[PDB]
Write a protein that binds this DNA or RNA. Sequence first.
DNA 1: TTTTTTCGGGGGGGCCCCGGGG
DNA 2: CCCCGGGGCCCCCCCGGC
Lengths: 344, 330, 354, 318, 258
Amino acid sequence: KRKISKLAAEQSLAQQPWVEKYRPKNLDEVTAQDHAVTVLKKTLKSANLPHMLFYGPPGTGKTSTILALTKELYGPDLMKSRILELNASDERGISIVREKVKNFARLTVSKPSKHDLENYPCPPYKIIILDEADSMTADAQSALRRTMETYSGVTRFCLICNYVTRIIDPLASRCSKFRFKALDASNAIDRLRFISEQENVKCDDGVLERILDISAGDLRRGITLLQSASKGAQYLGDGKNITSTQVEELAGVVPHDILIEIVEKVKSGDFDEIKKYVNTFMKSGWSAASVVNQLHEYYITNDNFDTNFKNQISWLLFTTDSRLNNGTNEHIQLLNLLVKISQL
Amino acid sequence: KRSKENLPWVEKYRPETLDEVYGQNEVITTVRKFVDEGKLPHLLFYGPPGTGKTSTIVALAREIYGKNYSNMVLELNASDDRGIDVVRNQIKDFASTRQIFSKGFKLIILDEADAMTNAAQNALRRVIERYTKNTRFCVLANYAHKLTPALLSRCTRFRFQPLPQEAIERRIANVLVHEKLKLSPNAEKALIELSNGDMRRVLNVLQSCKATLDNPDEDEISDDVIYECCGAPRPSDLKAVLKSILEDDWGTAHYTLNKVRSAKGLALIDLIEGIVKILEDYELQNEETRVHLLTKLADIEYSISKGGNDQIQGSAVIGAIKASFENETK
Amino acid sequence: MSLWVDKYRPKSLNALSHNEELTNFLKSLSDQPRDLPHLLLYGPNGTGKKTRCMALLESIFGPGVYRLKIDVRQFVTASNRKLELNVVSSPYHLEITPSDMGNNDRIVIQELLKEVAQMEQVDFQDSKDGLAHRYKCVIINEANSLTKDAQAALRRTMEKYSKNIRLIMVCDSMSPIIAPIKSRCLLIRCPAPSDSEISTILSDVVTNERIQLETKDILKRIAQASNGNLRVSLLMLESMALNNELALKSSSPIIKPDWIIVIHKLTRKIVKERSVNSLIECRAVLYDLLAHCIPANIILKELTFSLLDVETLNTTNKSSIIEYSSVFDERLSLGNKAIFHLEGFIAKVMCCLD
Amino acid sequence: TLSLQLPWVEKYRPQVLSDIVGNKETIDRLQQIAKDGNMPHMIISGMPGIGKTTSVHCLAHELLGRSYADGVLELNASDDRGIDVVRNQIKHFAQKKLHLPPGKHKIVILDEADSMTAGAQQALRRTMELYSNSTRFAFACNQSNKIIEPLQSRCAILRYSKLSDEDVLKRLLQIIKLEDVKYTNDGLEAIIFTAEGDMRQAINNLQSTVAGHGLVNADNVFKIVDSPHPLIVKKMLLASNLEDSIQILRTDLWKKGYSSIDIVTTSFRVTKNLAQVKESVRLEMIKEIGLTHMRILEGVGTYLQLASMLAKIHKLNN
Amino acid sequence: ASMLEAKFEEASLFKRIIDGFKDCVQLVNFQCKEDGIIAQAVDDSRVLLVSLEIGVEAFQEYRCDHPVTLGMDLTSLSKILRCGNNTDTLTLIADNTPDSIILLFEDTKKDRIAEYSLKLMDIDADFLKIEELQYDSTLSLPSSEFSKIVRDLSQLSDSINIMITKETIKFVADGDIGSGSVIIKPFVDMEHPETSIKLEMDQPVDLTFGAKYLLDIIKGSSLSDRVGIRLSSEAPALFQFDLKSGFLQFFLAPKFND
DNA sequence: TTTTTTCGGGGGGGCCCCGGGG
DNA sequence: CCCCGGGGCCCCCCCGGC
Ligand SMILES: Nc1ncnc2c1ncn2[C@@H]1O[C@H](COP(=O)(O)OP(=O)(O)OP(O)(O)=S)[C@@H](O)[C@H]1O
Ligand SMILES: Nc1ncnc2c1ncn2[C@@H]1O[C@H](COP(=O)(O)OP(=O)(O)OP(O)(O)=S)[C@@H](O)[C@H]1O
Ligand SMILES: Nc1ncnc2c1ncn2[C@@H]1O[C@H](COP(=O)(O)OP(=O)(O)OP(O)(O)=S)[C@@H](O)[C@H]1O
Ligand SMILES: Nc1nc2c(ncn2[C@@H]2O[C@H](COP(=O)(O)OP(=O)(O)O)[C@@H](O)[C@H]2O)c(=O)[nH]1
Ligand SMILES: [Mg+2]
Ligand SMILES: [Mg+2]
Ligand SMILES: [Mg+2]
């Protein structure tokens, strides 16, 4: 084997996907979570960090925030010995919580080096990070209740989740709660523009705003969309600017003309015509969730429909979205929704 | 573990004596009377989270045994193994042997006993009955349905109510004095409202509010600080959203909801909960209105608990409220 | 020899003959593969998703991606249960179908994939740019069949070890995929080929195989009957050619699968007879269909759409049928015993028809 | 204070069969057996705190006299009762040679026998059959169904019923006279009502009330013993107007610190035992309660879910 | 290797000391100060208290600048100590604010160095003063005979009753299969002053103890050839094994007489 | 007139191998 | 130096509400 020399961390990161390449490295790179980032920064000097429960929708900056906080607190050298990270990729049964987590929590804090004490605050406790904590069973969660309180003097717990309701009430009570807000064009445009400028991506006016609107609160999705658009523009090699239409095509948004055709077919009210059109439409591979979202946007915001129609269609759309969230056949659900709307 | 000032406020302010437990005057008085005259029975403490059960039992242990209580009581919780073998060996040995240090009776505290298996609970029955002359048991629970009837028959039950307002105010005053903090009356009202009778929530939110101030020495905590740190809707926002839903057209209501949410990045669940609380006080002529409101809002809450599309859920809330209130006309 | 569906499968991006825009997008992706993110290709079945994935891999690495071997991996559960996993591997990529382990698929994600993720590549695989390849590709087939726990386990594995591995997932629908996974992947829509493109492919196969054709209308009819499924169209063409001595006539009928015929018979029986005895016989037919590896969801979809094509039913009956189909498809998604839900759907349809 | 007052349930534990109140026929049969002898294999089943263990121990004591220490083997759930124990220790005790009065036998008291495994019960069959000439077996349990049929066939079934309010009042008055307890009729009535036929609960509540307040009246008794929440739930489910049911839920249950899971489980049980309502209506209410219970188990334990459940029940009852 | 440096000339002595009570307790706090090492632990059932003391005469060299507390899991410590040969000196090393303890096995003749590190644990235990009590009876007997008696009686019952009367010590056990009683009397032999049984009685005593705890306690017989038992009504029984410089003590609570 | 899925707990059979005795 | 007793894992089998 020829073998390959080890690759430096800087160049390794430079060749990573944009989502990982531009992950926040310190608490100042988190864009729109000041209501919690300010408190976490104040803990750097207060040195009384409480048990934390970060909860929020996908791609809002929870894992990035906890990693940045741990780094700022301990330093590159002392971080490894002061952190115990367990996620959904590891076994986290009641036995694990009772034995391994408890043993780590009971341990004495690793001694900081002289350099670490000169540079980093080095608080007198370690941190256990239970990422994707909503996947843990109720009994395993209950096994943590007294472990958290007994060893608070040397250990602090951080639980991260998307659905706060899956955390048992005692644990939520024990933890200080931090809700991570959805990232939209009004609070995350600066970070996306910075990323675009750093990558010399040329986009028309409003393209980044359109990407953020399509992402629907997920900045990771927006960054991935921007990277895909940049790759397409580079491959084309024409020097032209990225357009909103290209972003919509990359994001799987149904073209407006197809939506108008669907709306007219629904207005017609003929069952067979709607069925045939939907059969043809599902061959394009459009995601049913996107179609339902676009239909909701078209109908709720239209001024040509009365209050009763909107009241009924809102419930119809809610029911269809709930059924789709369970992993159901898209064709059947979309046909049922369209027929029910047509009968309104 | 350098000093007590490096601890979270929830643990830093844990009561040390029964005199520091607030909002449970009946239970505290009764247990103190039992202890004073040596008439302590087997105890069960049933209550919701963060009401003072563990604190109360630890304070009672200190009252009975003193500063060295930890070596004179057998404390087991969910973080420990409490299987049938443990009951047969460790608890049985502790209950049937004299104290090493003193000559008093022996206390066993089974915290979070609702997490114990049925077999262990059944095994505990004859242990409790046989060694009553020299041993007492204290059980702590949040859910009574997990306790076997045989165990319940053998214990005297005390219910820890959700903390009243006055106890929370007095504890907040103590914390403010200790921390050198200023709290506005409206801020205190909002903190008590959001606490829902849990002291841990009050303490965590107060610590976050202190961390949110630029200069805690002179800056005061206002309702705005509370709402910002907790990221919760203000009463004005809830009132405006409800008024728009109940008095405006669909377009205006949708725009108002979106603008209110986007102004401070509010969560739809908080808006739904606040609107439900507001509507609970409405005097409705027709019961069908209330029935539909409750059912549809519960469905929306359950759907939100599993994720989904936020915009569709908000439109569903608007439509459900409008449709339900359409029945009040006739 | 090999079936015409397999013998003429394209082996490169430049060999693709339909959905040119998707080909251009894939070529753009493969231009600078060093920073390629995780990919999730979603589209209708039998469209060419796996073919395009293999073509993209060939473009990134080279022809060697098609030198495939099969190995067997051992797994042990908490109950000391020995499980076998068939892994399709290449010098540049691995292929896994964790759904083969059912509820144990999590283990495959927790141990196998992680083991590959933690292992850095030390093979000097010189690329076009002149620098050796850095990551190893892993394909997860039928990703929509993964349990929620396995998908949750995939999250930090994807995030932490992106420098060592890149995931390519293929699915018919994204509805069963959890939001965190979709957020972590670049989503690629794979539209079904048009009728003209299917006819062109079929005519190319016909001329390569020297098959007598009376007219080009037979290929159009085959494409129409396939409903945009290219694999089905090719297999149907081969079956028709075999059944007619390699000489297709304008009157040659379209050959349908046995299970399709059984479902059509069941639909006719349901429409004709609506009683409890008919329900018992329908249960027998459903048991027969399920015993021979006919998925419950496929049965429900085919039954619903066959019923909706009946000409005697009116608008109200069809609306009720589609509503019940939606409800019971959700029930199947959230259930274990499929026969229960299928019988409930048939009973509701029988009640509605009367 | 390091002193402990002996509980009255132990200080006044019956020592002879004559001091056991309730189940007159069964106690009379036990007394006749004790006077005569030839005790058969027996299984005693009943609800908690009615005098099963007391009856068995009194019977054994009066039957064996001074030979109680040598001729009685007592095993309960707190002891090890596995297959090895049954096969070795119990068998050895059965085979043990011990001279006894003309009509007495060694007694094995397996208390709380319903917790024994199937294997141990199977192993007991031949031990019981082979050594019946010198050993007899007494089982005490709460659920007789848990005892395997082969063992039930070899035993005499003596089922105990809940004690009537009269027996509870008699025993409470005896204990009060012995202890010189100040009381009022309303206090005793409240104690009996809250006990629900459980003598141990009644005695414990009386002792706790005397210790906490001295005077045993209605006010002090309710201050010690809380109102049974099942009755509150039953009132909630049978309310005429949905507003009244919601008010009960918000004031008597939710604000008193009762968890949603407890409320939903109690609602399920009460609806199951609501003979006043038609069975089909009860089944519909049970379906709705199950939906709400599943939602709570998924983690949505909010008051809104309970309010929605009450609204749906009200719609069903309309 | 600055604050605490304590060298056992024989590495087997520390292993024996740890093995004497490793089956009784798991988490132990060792307090090291200028005059030596002390340790106190309470069993999980809180029925047995173990107290170890080692003076500075037991070390070839010993240096401690300030008092240091080391919380250790005895299972891990025993595992580490099992990796040392009997011909190697054993140095215990600890620094300021320590998170670990270093055990260094040296074989100068073979020039072999074996260094191990054991992570410390945070144990919130305050040394509880074992107040001296004027016991009613105090006896001393060879450890081997006591171990044999305890092992023989443990086969019959889970409880052993010790009765101290004028000129007599009686150990009784009663169980399912039968009973046993061993009676000994104070005996002195000047020829061999190691098999002698000594007794000093002020008030006769009768105390019952769990057999498992006595079985655990007798494991200290490998440290001393004699064991001293101090018994007094209304007080824990003290079992002491004397080392060259220090001792190992077990305080065992009697069973309630009811 | 016959015969299925999962954790966690508990039980019970089967070795394995250290220690101690001869 | 070799055999025997008995602690400790390892593996598998069955329950689960009132
Ligand atoms: N607040 C943010 N500021 C800057 N970048 C962000 C932010 N949130 C997300 N991102 C970007 O998206 C990527 C993923 O962010 P994450 O911290 O992993 O989100 P997440 O909330 O942990 O996702 P989940 O809950 O596991 S689905 C980061 O590397 C960033 O590049
Ligand atoms: N009555 C109270 N008075 C003062 N502080 C209280 C009180 N109750 C709870 N707290 C505060 O909240 C913290 C936790 O109290 P706990 O006694 O642990 O409540 P708990 O009921 O035992 O919680 P669970 O049942 O384990 S979820 C205490 O350290 C106090 O700081
Ligand atoms: N019939 C009774 N007469 C007098 N006292 C009784 C009677 N029943 C119960 N008690 C009293 O309550 C105490 C407990 O009675 P038990 O005999 O233990 O009830 P039990 O049937 O064994 O309960 P379970 O099934 O083991 S939970 C006795 O010591 C008595 O003091
Ligand atoms: N001539 C031609 N055949 C294709 C093309 N794409 C797919 N196919 C054929 O269609 C068959 C099925 O495609 P497949 O990759 O299995 O679709 P999937 O089920 O969505 O992954 C393949 O065996 C190919 O032979 C194409 O672009 N050109
Ligand atoms: Mg994350
Ligand atoms: Mg507690
Ligand atoms: Mg009993």
